[PDB]
């Protein structure tokens, strides 16, 4: 997981089409809110070729990665979701913070030099991270590198969410089961700039200029609540 690139297969048209749709939009590609997109590529697979997207690896050259995946939206199903998955989708949405906050914990990795990374399962979302207060604490734990709280990194993450909110108010796209990914290298300085905050996983993105999506995603609602939590974390790290 330590190369320049992520070569992600195109298992459906939606992620590929979204990247192609915004590829000349400076609001998407010049703001640093999504991974850098290199293009769609065909690579040999089976009897023919398989379509891939090539994007930057956000953790390139990270020494001790810290990773936090936050799933955004008031629901994680869309009009194309298979019926066999629907009961589980409805339960997890309602018993996590998804329906209430539009954002929920979806996994964490912390490397504190303890000879093995500490993995926090995404299934913690319906039991241990099922409240706003518990979600705030786990994000605080993400900013804990094992020795201190990296309070200086928080303003970057709020700034990233601000740019995300600005583009999503235009409501040109609906996104389901997408995430905002928090990463940083604990060995970094503010000048090394080895930290990042990006939207990812657009496999269920709808292009509203080309198709209808009746249900709402609650994506802007989730982004605002996540920004509010980080602002609370900023105010609470002042006592350090
Ligand atoms: N550009 C990136 N650079 C580095 N890591 C990434 C990047 N995009 C995603 N990741 C990480 O790598 C793994 C990425 O998955 P993706 O977002 O690719 O999942 P999926 O394959 O679409 O599966 P699912 O829908 O079940 O989450 C995730 O766990 C995410 O943390
Ligand atoms: Mg995902
Ligand atoms: Mg996906």
Residue numbers in the entry: 31 to 270
Sentences from the paper on this structure:
Inositol hexakisphosphate kinases (IP6Ks) are emerging as relevant pharmacological targets because a multitude of disease-related phenotypes has been associated with their function. Genetic knockouts of the three mammalian inositol hexakisphosphate kinase (IP6K) isozymes – enzymes involved in PP-InsP biosynthesis – have revealed their involvement in distinct biological processes, including insulin signaling, apoptosis, cancer metastasis, and lifespan regulation in mice. Here, we implemented the analog-sensitive approach for IP6Ks to identify isozyme-selective inhibitors. While the exact structures of mammalian IP6Ks have remained elusive to date, those of other members of the InsP kinase family, for example Homo sapiens IPMK and Entamoeba histolytica IP6KA, have successfully been deciphered.
